[PDB]
Scaffold this motif. Sequence first.
Motif, PDB file in Angstrom:
ATOM      1  N   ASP A   1       0.905  -1.148   0.000  1.00 32.04           N
ATOM      2  CA  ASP A   1       0.000   0.000   0.000  1.00 32.04           C
ATOM      3  C   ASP A   1       0.948   1.204   0.000  1.00 32.04           C
ATOM      4  O   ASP A   1       1.446   1.617   1.054  1.00 32.04           O
ATOM      5  CB  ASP A   1      -0.899  -0.028   1.253  1.00 32.04           C
ATOM      6  CG  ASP A   1      -1.888   1.119   1.447  1.00 32.04           C
ATOM      7  OD1 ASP A   1      -1.787   2.132   0.716  1.00 32.04           O
ATOM      8  OD2 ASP A   1      -2.691   1.048   2.405  1.00 32.04           O
ATOM      9  N   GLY A   2       1.239   1.680  -1.204  1.00 31.73           N
ATOM     10  CA  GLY A   2       2.169   2.768  -1.476  1.00 31.73           C
ATOM     11  C   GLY A   2       1.934   4.057  -0.713  1.00 31.73           C
ATOM     12  O   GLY A   2       2.865   4.591  -0.104  1.00 31.73           O
TER      13      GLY A   2
ATOM     14  N   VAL B   1       1.177  -0.619  -5.020  1.00 32.42           N
ATOM     15  CA  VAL B   1      -0.133  -0.090  -5.398  1.00 32.42           C
ATOM     16  C   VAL B   1      -0.308   1.318  -4.831  1.00 32.42           C
ATOM     17  O   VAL B   1      -0.287   1.528  -3.613  1.00 32.42           O
ATOM     18  CB  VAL B   1      -1.296  -1.055  -5.003  1.00 32.42           C
ATOM     19  CG1 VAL B   1      -2.673  -0.458  -5.343  1.00 32.42           C
ATOM     20  CG2 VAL B   1      -1.121  -2.407  -5.676  1.00 32.42           C
ATOM     21  N   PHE B   2      -0.470   2.268  -5.730  1.00 34.48           N
ATOM     22  CA  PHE B   2      -0.680   3.665  -5.378  1.00 34.48           C
ATOM     23  C   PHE B   2      -2.108   4.089  -5.665  1.00 34.48           C
ATOM     24  O   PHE B   2      -2.624   3.843  -6.758  1.00 34.48           O
ATOM     25  CB  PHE B   2       0.280   4.579  -6.150  1.00 34.48           C
ATOM     26  CG  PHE B   2       1.721   4.478  -5.741  1.00 34.48           C
ATOM     27  CD1 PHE B   2       2.139   4.929  -4.494  1.00 34.48           C
ATOM     28  CD2 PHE B   2       2.679   3.992  -6.626  1.00 34.48           C
ATOM     29  CE1 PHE B   2       3.477   4.865  -4.128  1.00 34.48           C
ATOM     30  CE2 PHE B   2       4.021   3.940  -6.264  1.00 34.48           C
ATOM     31  CZ  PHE B   2       4.412   4.375  -5.013  1.00 34.48           C
ATOM     32  N   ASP B   3      -2.733   4.742  -4.689  1.00 34.58           N
ATOM     33  CA  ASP B   3      -4.059   5.314  -4.854  1.00 34.58           C
ATOM     34  C   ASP B   3      -3.860   6.501  -5.820  1.00 34.58           C
ATOM     35  O   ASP B   3      -3.135   7.434  -5.481  1.00 34.58           O
ATOM     36  CB  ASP B   3      -4.590   5.797  -3.493  1.00 34.58           C
ATOM     37  CG  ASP B   3      -6.005   6.327  -3.548  1.00 34.58           C
ATOM     38  OD1 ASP B   3      -6.236   7.323  -4.261  1.00 34.58           O
ATOM     39  OD2 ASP B   3      -6.883   5.732  -2.893  1.00 34.58           O
ATOM     40  N   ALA B   4      -4.444   6.425  -7.038  1.00 30.09           N
ATOM     41  CA  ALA B   4      -4.306   7.443  -8.100  1.00 30.09           C
ATOM     42  C   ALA B   4      -4.836   8.849  -7.740  1.00 30.09           C
ATOM     43  O   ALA B   4      -4.429   9.836  -8.362  1.00 30.09           O
ATOM     44  CB  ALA B   4      -4.951   6.957  -9.383  1.00 30.09           C
ATOM     45  N   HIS B   5      -5.723   8.941  -6.741  1.00 29.03           N
ATOM     46  CA  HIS B   5      -6.311  10.201  -6.279  1.00 29.03           C
ATOM     47  C   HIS B   5      -5.369  10.961  -5.310  1.00 29.03           C
ATOM     48  O   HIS B   5      -5.501  12.179  -5.168  1.00 29.03           O
ATOM     49  CB  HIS B   5      -7.690   9.917  -5.647  1.00 29.03           C
ATOM     50  CG  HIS B   5      -8.434  11.121  -5.151  1.00 29.03           C
ATOM     51  ND1 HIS B   5      -9.033  12.015  -6.026  1.00 29.03           N
ATOM     52  CD2 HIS B   5      -8.714  11.500  -3.880  1.00 29.03           C
ATOM     53  CE1 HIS B   5      -9.620  12.925  -5.263  1.00 29.03           C
ATOM     54  NE2 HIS B   5      -9.449  12.660  -3.965  1.00 29.03           N
TER      55      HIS B   5
ATOM     56  N   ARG C   1      -7.735  -2.948  -5.196  1.00 32.26           N
ATOM     57  CA  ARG C   1      -6.760  -3.362  -6.202  1.00 32.26           C
ATOM     58  C   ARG C   1      -5.864  -4.479  -5.671  1.00 32.26           C
ATOM     59  O   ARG C   1      -5.634  -5.463  -6.376  1.00 32.26           O
ATOM     60  CB  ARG C   1      -5.957  -2.163  -6.754  1.00 32.26           C
ATOM     61  CG  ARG C   1      -4.898  -2.539  -7.825  1.00 32.26           C
ATOM     62  CD  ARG C   1      -5.476  -3.221  -9.065  1.00 32.26           C
ATOM     63  NE  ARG C   1      -6.368  -2.305  -9.772  1.00 32.26           N
ATOM     64  CZ  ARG C   1      -6.193  -1.893 -11.019  1.00 32.26           C
ATOM     65  NH1 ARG C   1      -5.188  -2.368 -11.750  1.00 32.26           N
ATOM     66  NH2 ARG C   1      -7.031  -1.017 -11.554  1.00 32.26           N
ATOM     67  N   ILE C   2      -5.419  -4.356  -4.417  1.00 35.66           N
ATOM     68  CA  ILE C   2      -4.587  -5.360  -3.745  1.00 35.66           C
ATOM     69  C   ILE C   2      -5.332  -6.715  -3.681  1.00 35.66           C
ATOM     70  O   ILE C   2      -4.723  -7.747  -3.978  1.00 35.66           O
ATOM     71  CB  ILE C   2      -4.052  -4.846  -2.381  1.00 35.66           C
ATOM     72  CG1 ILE C   2      -2.865  -3.873  -2.613  1.00 35.66           C
ATOM     73  CG2 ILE C   2      -3.626  -5.995  -1.462  1.00 35.66           C
ATOM     74  CD1 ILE C   2      -2.493  -2.960  -1.443  1.00 35.66           C
ATOM     75  N   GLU C   3      -6.654  -6.697  -3.384  1.00 40.54           N
ATOM     76  CA  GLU C   3      -7.493  -7.902  -3.365  1.00 40.54           C
ATOM     77  C   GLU C   3      -7.547  -8.556  -4.774  1.00 40.54           C
ATOM     78  O   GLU C   3      -7.382  -9.768  -4.882  1.00 40.54           O
ATOM     79  CB  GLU C   3      -8.912  -7.576  -2.862  1.00 40.54           C
ATOM     80  CG  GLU C   3      -9.799  -8.802  -2.669  1.00 40.54           C
ATOM     81  CD  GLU C   3     -11.258  -8.510  -2.370  1.00 40.54           C
ATOM     82  OE1 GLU C   3     -11.837  -9.225  -1.523  1.00 40.54           O
ATOM     83  OE2 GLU C   3     -11.825  -7.574  -2.978  1.00 40.54           O
ATOM     84  N   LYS C   4      -7.770  -7.755  -5.830  1.00 37.93           N
ATOM     85  CA  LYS C   4      -7.809  -8.224  -7.223  1.00 37.93           C
ATOM     86  C   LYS C   4      -6.479  -8.884  -7.604  1.00 37.93           C
ATOM     87  O   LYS C   4      -6.493  -9.984  -8.169  1.00 37.93           O
ATOM     88  CB  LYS C   4      -8.120  -7.070  -8.191  1.00 37.93           C
ATOM     89  CG  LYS C   4      -9.593  -6.672  -8.232  1.00 37.93           C
ATOM     90  CD  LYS C   4      -9.784  -5.324  -8.908  1.00 37.93           C
ATOM     91  CE  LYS C   4     -11.130  -4.706  -8.609  1.00 37.93           C
ATOM     92  NZ  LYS C   4     -11.244  -3.328  -9.157  1.00 37.93           N
TER      93      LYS C   4
ATOM     94  N   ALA D   1       1.656  -5.118   2.756  1.00 34.07           N
ATOM     95  CA  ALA D   1       2.257  -4.079   3.597  1.00 34.07           C
ATOM     96  C   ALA D   1       1.307  -2.887   3.717  1.00 34.07           C
ATOM     97  O   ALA D   1       1.111  -2.145   2.751  1.00 34.07           O
ATOM     98  CB  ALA D   1       3.602  -3.642   3.034  1.00 34.07           C
ATOM     99  N   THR D   2       0.683  -2.746   4.906  1.00 28.07           N
ATOM    100  CA  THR D   2      -0.247  -1.666   5.271  1.00 28.07           C
ATOM    101  C   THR D   2      -0.511  -1.617   6.777  1.00 28.07           C
ATOM    102  O   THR D   2      -0.647  -2.658   7.427  1.00 28.07           O
ATOM    103  CB  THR D   2      -1.575  -1.694   4.440  1.00 28.07           C
ATOM    104  OG1 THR D   2      -2.272  -0.463   4.628  1.00 28.07           O
ATOM    105  CG2 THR D   2      -2.492  -2.886   4.758  1.00 28.07           C
TER     106      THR D   2
END
Lengths: 174, 174
Positions: free
Chosen positions: A7-8, A51-55, A83-86, A101-102
């Motif tokens: 989780d970026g 994985v980065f949240d684009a917002h 996205r991490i689940e997918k 990692a979160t």
Amino acid sequence: MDILLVDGYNMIGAWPQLKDLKANSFEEARDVLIQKMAEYQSYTGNRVIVVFDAHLVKGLEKKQTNHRVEVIFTKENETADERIEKLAQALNNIATQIHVATSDYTEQWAIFGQGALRKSARELLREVETIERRIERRVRKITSEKPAGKIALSEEVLKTFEKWRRGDLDAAAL
Amino acid sequence: MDILLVDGYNMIGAWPQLKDLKANSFEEARDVLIQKMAEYQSYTGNRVIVVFDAHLVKGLEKKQTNHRVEVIFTKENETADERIEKLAQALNNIATQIHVATSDYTEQWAIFGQGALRKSARELLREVETIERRIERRVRKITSEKPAGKIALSEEVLKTFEKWRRGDLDAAAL
């Protein structure tokens, strides 16, 4: 095996070296994190996906990233946990353990009820700091032994010294 | 400013990290010396010219060396001290002090009777070792302050670690 899904944005907000590199939607923090994850992937041999949240985090916009790290941005209205689940479902196999990692608890994190293991922001940081120091020690040892193997590195050290001296690194955040 | 004229072969034979890199007419020793002289030129701001005796040191051929260092090979029956004298005479100006790095006493060294100052192999090495440590410390300081300024360097550190691990540095001398 072990695949690490990161989780970026959460790492950015929790790591001291990252949390203050907020300019242009954490552009510098994103870049430093990708480089840290390249070191982690290479040292451990574990597959790493950031994985980065684009917002919240600045998009790449055709700019090529480290080949050692897969970097994924969420869709509009999609959170990092979704996205991490997918990703974990697409790479879901009996002989592989998914690590996430979160340190976030605001989101559902439905994947933690599907066999994935939770790794805290602090735990990933410690691992990253130890790996960084280990790689540096190994490189210092072999470049002392084989001086001709230090040339490309010394050139890069020298370029950084000259960039600093002419004020090329003034624009960057602390 | 000051101009440093270096007896390349003499440094190679006198410096511990250079003297054993003898393969293919001191090819590795020549390369390490050029990189050390790039650091010296950049730190001091002094012009540096490295003179290699063409019968003892492997020629550059294709190799386009560090833009920070002028590298000159002697002609057929010409010794390094003769080329160094020609260079000092060609660059002889009122506001300039010529320094010659050499511990050799087998040659005439006629330039030492023409205002040029003699710097020993040991003295140049001591200066190089101090400059190396200083550049490294300044780069570690600024990259700690500005983490985004460390990315190109970390990538080079990582490349060196991977080169070592896959046995790419085995061929190099110690």
